[PDB]
Protein backbone atom coordinates (compact mmCIF):
# COMPACT_ATOMS: atom_id res chain seq x y z
CA UNK A 1 0.00 0.00 0.00
CA UNK A 2 2.67 2.33 -0.98
CA UNK A 3 0.23 5.00 -1.32
CA UNK A 4 -1.78 4.74 1.25
CA UNK A 5 1.73 4.77 3.15
CA UNK A 6 2.45 8.26 1.51
CA UNK A 7 -1.41 9.56 2.24
CA UNK A 8 -1.11 8.94 5.87
CA UNK A 9 2.81 9.92 6.35
CA UNK A 10 2.06 13.38 5.26
CA UNK A 11 -1.29 13.76 6.93
CA UNK A 12 -1.40 17.12 8.99
CA UNK A 13 -1.68 16.84 12.93
CA UNK A 14 -4.03 18.89 14.91
CA UNK A 15 -4.19 22.51 14.50
CA UNK A 16 -6.01 24.92 16.89
CA UNK A 17 -7.73 28.09 16.12
CA UNK A 18 -6.54 30.26 19.09
CA UNK A 19 -10.45 30.88 20.53
CA UNK A 20 -11.02 32.52 23.54
CA UNK A 21 -13.76 30.07 24.98
CA UNK A 22 -13.82 32.14 28.11
CA UNK A 23 -15.67 35.15 26.58
CA UNK A 24 -18.93 35.09 25.54
CA UNK A 25 -20.12 34.31 22.25
CA UNK A 26 -20.34 37.07 19.09
CA UNK A 27 -20.14 37.22 15.66
CA UNK A 28 -17.32 39.35 14.94
CA UNK A 29 -15.05 36.91 17.26
CA UNK A 30 -16.13 33.38 15.67
CA UNK A 31 -15.06 34.88 12.18
CA UNK A 32 -12.17 36.48 13.33
CA UNK A 33 -11.39 33.26 14.93
CA UNK A 34 -12.28 31.26 11.76
CA UNK A 35 -10.22 33.55 9.64
CA UNK A 36 -7.56 32.93 12.21
CA UNK A 37 -7.75 29.19 11.61
CA UNK A 38 -8.56 29.38 8.11
CA UNK A 39 -5.26 30.97 7.50
CA UNK A 40 -3.18 28.40 9.68
CA UNK A 41 -4.56 25.60 7.83
CA UNK A 42 -3.95 27.12 4.92
CA UNK A 43 -0.18 26.59 5.76
CA UNK A 44 -0.91 23.27 6.55
CA UNK A 45 -2.78 22.40 3.32
CA UNK A 46 0.69 23.56 1.06
CA UNK A 47 3.13 21.38 3.12
CA UNK A 48 1.00 18.62 2.30
CA UNK A 49 -0.16 19.28 -1.13
CA UNK A 50 3.64 19.88 -2.02
CA UNK A 51 4.62 16.35 -0.05
CA UNK A 52 1.84 14.59 -2.64
CA UNK A 53 2.52 12.00 -5.13
CA UNK A 54 3.32 13.21 -8.30
CA UNK A 55 2.50 16.88 -7.51
CA UNK A 56 5.55 18.29 -8.78
CA UNK A 57 4.93 17.46 -12.16
CA UNK A 58 2.55 20.21 -12.66
CA UNK A 59 3.08 23.55 -13.71
CA UNK A 60 4.53 25.52 -10.45
CA UNK A 61 1.79 28.10 -11.31
CA UNK A 62 -0.82 25.79 -11.32
CA UNK A 63 -0.02 24.36 -8.10
CA UNK A 64 0.13 27.70 -6.79
CA UNK A 65 -4.09 27.63 -8.10
CA UNK A 66 -5.36 23.93 -7.76
CA UNK A 67 -4.18 25.13 -3.71
CA UNK A 68 -6.11 28.44 -3.31
CA UNK A 69 -9.08 27.15 -5.46
CA UNK A 70 -9.09 24.18 -3.76
CA UNK A 71 -8.33 24.63 0.02
CA UNK A 72 -12.12 25.60 1.22
CA UNK A 73 -13.25 22.41 -0.43
CA UNK A 74 -10.37 20.40 1.58
CA UNK A 75 -10.80 21.70 4.72
CA UNK A 76 -15.13 21.38 5.05
CA UNK A 77 -14.59 17.63 4.23
CA UNK A 78 -11.22 17.35 6.60
CA UNK A 79 -13.74 19.28 9.06
CA UNK A 80 -16.55 17.24 8.02
CA UNK A 81 -14.28 14.09 9.02
CA UNK A 82 -13.11 15.07 12.30
CA UNK A 83 -16.13 16.51 13.39
CA UNK A 84 -17.62 12.33 12.66
CA UNK A 85 -14.59 10.68 14.28
CA UNK A 86 -14.57 13.12 17.48
CA UNK A 87 -18.05 14.22 18.55
CA UNK A 88 -20.13 11.68 15.79
CA UNK A 89 -21.40 14.80 14.00
CA UNK A 90 -22.93 15.95 17.31
CA UNK A 91 -21.44 19.46 16.56
CA UNK A 92 -18.86 20.64 14.02
CA UNK A 93 -14.84 20.38 15.50
CA UNK A 94 -13.51 22.88 13.30
CA UNK A 95 -10.60 22.55 15.71
CA UNK A 96 -10.15 21.54 19.27
CA UNK A 97 -10.87 25.18 20.58
CA UNK A 98 -13.59 25.81 18.83
CA UNK A 99 -16.44 23.75 18.36
CA UNK A 100 -19.76 24.76 17.14
CA UNK A 101 -22.97 23.39 19.14
CA UNK A 102 -26.16 24.90 17.02
CA UNK A 103 -26.26 28.35 19.17
CA UNK A 104 -22.45 29.61 17.57
CA UNK A 105 -23.75 27.95 14.22
CA UNK A 106 -26.64 30.84 15.01
CA UNK A 107 -24.19 33.19 16.24
CA UNK A 108 -21.62 32.40 13.39
CA UNK A 109 -25.15 33.66 10.88
CA UNK A 110 -23.78 31.11 8.84
CA UNK A 111 -26.41 28.77 9.80
CA UNK A 112 -27.45 27.25 6.30
CA UNK A 113 -24.09 26.38 5.60
CA UNK A 114 -23.50 24.78 8.94
CA UNK A 115 -26.21 22.70 8.71
CA UNK A 116 -25.12 21.37 5.46
CA UNK A 117 -21.39 20.27 6.72
CA UNK A 118 -23.08 18.76 9.51
CA UNK A 119 -24.83 17.02 7.17
CA UNK A 120 -21.39 16.10 5.48
CA UNK A 121 -20.45 14.90 8.71
CA UNK A 122 -22.91 12.47 9.10
CA UNK A 123 -22.49 10.82 5.79
CA UNK A 124 -19.31 9.56 7.00
CA UNK A 125 -21.10 7.76 9.16
CA UNK A 126 -24.02 6.43 7.18
CA UNK A 127 -21.32 5.34 3.97
CA UNK A 128 -19.69 3.84 7.17
CA UNK A 129 -16.20 5.93 5.01
CA UNK A 130 -12.77 4.08 6.50
CA UNK A 131 -10.02 6.22 7.37
CA UNK A 132 -7.89 5.00 4.39
CA UNK A 133 -10.98 6.08 1.98
CA UNK A 134 -11.11 9.55 3.48
CA UNK A 135 -7.33 10.07 2.87
CA UNK A 136 -7.86 8.77 -1.00
CA UNK A 137 -11.32 11.16 -1.50
CA UNK A 138 -9.42 14.34 0.24
CA UNK A 139 -6.38 14.38 -1.83
CA UNK A 140 -8.48 13.79 -5.11
CA UNK A 141 -10.63 16.56 -3.73
CA UNK A 142 -7.17 19.06 -4.17
CA UNK A 143 -7.47 18.29 -8.56
CA UNK A 144 -11.13 18.70 -8.56
CA UNK A 145 -11.45 22.70 -9.36
CA UNK A 146 -10.03 24.49 -12.69
CA UNK A 147 -10.36 27.49 -14.66
CA UNK A 148 -13.07 26.64 -17.51
CA UNK A 149 -10.28 28.25 -20.03
CA UNK A 150 -7.39 25.90 -19.03
CA UNK A 151 -4.49 25.34 -16.70
CA UNK A 152 -0.77 26.36 -17.55
CA UNK A 153 -0.04 22.90 -18.49
CA UNK A 154 -3.73 21.05 -18.29
CA UNK A 155 -1.79 17.82 -19.75
CA UNK A 156 -0.04 17.51 -16.29
CA UNK A 157 -2.88 17.95 -14.46
CA UNK A 158 -5.15 15.67 -16.48
CA UNK A 159 -2.48 12.74 -16.13
CA UNK A 160 -2.35 13.56 -12.09
CA UNK A 161 -5.95 13.88 -11.25
CA UNK A 162 -6.42 10.28 -13.55
CA UNK A 163 -3.88 8.72 -11.37
CA UNK A 164 -5.61 9.46 -8.11
CA UNK A 165 -9.04 8.12 -9.24
CA UNK A 166 -6.91 5.00 -10.31
CA UNK A 167 -5.81 5.00 -6.36
CA UNK A 168 -9.19 5.50 -4.97
CA UNK A 169 -10.65 2.72 -7.18
CA UNK A 170 -7.88 0.82 -5.81
CA UNK A 171 -8.70 0.82 -2.04
CA UNK A 172 -12.25 0.44 -3.03
CA UNK A 173 -11.42 -3.13 -4.88
CA UNK A 174 -9.19 -3.81 -2.12
CA UNK A 175 -21.68 -4.86 -7.62
CA UNK A 176 -20.33 -3.59 -4.49
CA UNK A 177 -17.33 -1.93 -5.79
CA UNK A 178 -19.58 -0.47 -8.32
CA UNK A 179 -21.81 0.91 -6.04
CA UNK A 180 -19.60 2.51 -3.61
CA UNK A 181 -17.61 4.25 -6.11
CA UNK A 182 -21.00 5.98 -7.05
CA UNK A 183 -21.37 6.60 -3.02
CA UNK A 184 -18.18 8.12 -2.96
CA UNK A 185 -18.04 10.86 -5.82
CA UNK A 186 -21.91 11.55 -5.18
CA UNK A 187 -20.46 12.42 -1.63
CA UNK A 188 -17.31 14.74 -3.13
CA UNK A 189 -19.28 16.53 -5.38
CA UNK A 190 -21.19 17.54 -2.79
CA UNK A 191 -18.67 19.31 -1.14
CA UNK A 192 -18.31 22.02 -3.71
CA UNK A 193 -21.52 23.89 -3.13
CA UNK A 194 -21.15 23.95 0.71
CA UNK A 195 -17.60 25.56 -0.20
CA UNK A 196 -19.24 28.26 -2.69
CA UNK A 197 -21.66 28.68 -0.27
CA UNK A 198 -18.92 30.00 2.42
CA UNK A 199 -16.93 31.82 -0.41
CA UNK A 200 -20.07 34.00 -1.10
CA UNK A 201 -21.16 34.51 2.41
CA UNK A 202 -17.35 35.47 3.18
CA UNK A 203 -16.55 37.40 -0.15
CA UNK A 204 -20.52 39.86 0.73
CA UNK A 205 -18.88 40.43 4.09
CA UNK A 206 -15.45 41.11 3.16
CA UNK A 207 -16.84 44.05 0.71
CA UNK A 208 -19.61 45.26 3.47
CA UNK A 209 -16.74 44.94 6.19
CA UNK A 210 -16.30 48.83 6.43
CA UNK A 211 -19.85 48.40 7.92
CA UNK A 212 -19.93 45.37 10.06
CA UNK A 213 -16.04 46.28 10.48
CA UNK A 214 -14.10 43.22 10.56
CA UNK A 215 -10.35 42.90 10.53
CA UNK A 216 -9.95 40.53 7.54
CA UNK A 217 -6.33 39.85 7.38
CA UNK A 218 -2.98 39.03 5.53
CA UNK A 219 -4.16 36.07 2.78
CA UNK A 220 -7.31 36.14 3.52
CA UNK A 221 -8.29 39.41 1.71
CA UNK A 222 -5.88 38.48 -1.03
CA UNK A 223 -7.45 35.05 -1.97
CA UNK A 224 -11.24 36.52 -1.10
CA UNK A 225 -10.83 39.17 -3.36
CA UNK A 226 -8.12 37.77 -6.54
CA UNK A 227 -9.31 34.29 -6.31
CA UNK A 228 -12.32 33.54 -5.05
CA UNK A 229 -14.41 35.76 -7.35
CA UNK A 230 -13.39 33.65 -10.33
CA UNK A 231 -15.30 30.76 -8.78
CA UNK A 232 -18.02 33.19 -7.98
CA UNK A 233 -18.09 34.51 -11.41
CA UNK A 234 -17.96 30.69 -13.11
CA UNK A 235 -14.38 31.37 -14.26
CA UNK A 236 -13.54 28.70 -12.27
CA UNK A 237 -16.02 25.45 -11.63
CA UNK A 238 -15.53 22.39 -10.39
CA UNK A 239 -15.23 18.69 -11.80
CA UNK A 240 -18.08 17.05 -11.00
CA UNK A 241 -18.63 12.96 -11.49
CA UNK A 242 -22.48 13.29 -11.90
CA UNK A 243 -24.38 15.66 -13.57
CA UNK A 244 -26.18 18.20 -10.61
CA UNK B 1 1.18 38.54 -3.04
CA UNK B 2 0.82 36.99 0.34
CA UNK B 3 -0.34 33.42 -0.55
CA UNK B 4 2.88 33.18 -3.50
CA UNK B 5 5.20 34.14 -0.59
CA UNK B 6 3.93 31.09 1.93
CA UNK B 7 3.72 28.57 -1.14
CA UNK B 8 7.76 29.68 -1.65
CA UNK B 9 8.50 29.73 1.68
CA UNK B 10 7.49 25.84 2.05
CA UNK B 11 10.68 23.62 1.46
C1 LIG C 1 -16.20 31.92 6.82
N1 LIG C 1 -15.03 31.02 6.88
C2 LIG C 1 -14.99 29.67 7.37
S1 LIG C 1 -16.09 28.88 7.88
N2 LIG C 1 -13.63 29.17 7.29
C3 LIG C 1 -13.05 27.97 7.77
C4 LIG C 1 -11.93 27.96 8.59
C5 LIG C 1 -11.45 26.72 8.99
C6 LIG C 1 -12.12 25.56 8.64
CL1 LIG C 1 -11.47 24.04 9.17
C7 LIG C 1 -13.18 25.56 7.78
CL2 LIG C 1 -13.99 24.13 7.30
C8 LIG C 1 -13.69 26.79 7.42
C9 LIG C 1 -12.87 30.22 6.73
O1 LIG C 1 -11.70 30.19 6.51
C10 LIG C 1 -13.69 31.38 6.45
C11 LIG C 1 -13.13 32.59 7.24
C12 LIG C 1 -13.59 31.64 4.94
C13 LIG C 1 -12.51 32.34 4.44
C14 LIG C 1 -12.41 32.59 3.08
C15 LIG C 1 -13.39 32.16 2.18
O2 LIG C 1 -13.28 32.41 0.81
C16 LIG C 1 -14.46 31.41 2.71
C17 LIG C 1 -14.55 31.15 4.07
Redesign the interface.
Known amino acids: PIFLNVLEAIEPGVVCAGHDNNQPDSFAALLSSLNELGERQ??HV??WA?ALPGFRNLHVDD??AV??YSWMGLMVFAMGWRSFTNVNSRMLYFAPDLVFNEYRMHKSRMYSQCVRMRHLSQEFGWLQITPQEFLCMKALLLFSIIPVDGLKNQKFFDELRMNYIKELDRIIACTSCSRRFYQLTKLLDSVQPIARELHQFTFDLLIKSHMVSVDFP??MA??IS?QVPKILSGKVKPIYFHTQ | ????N??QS??
Open positions: LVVKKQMIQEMEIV | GAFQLFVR
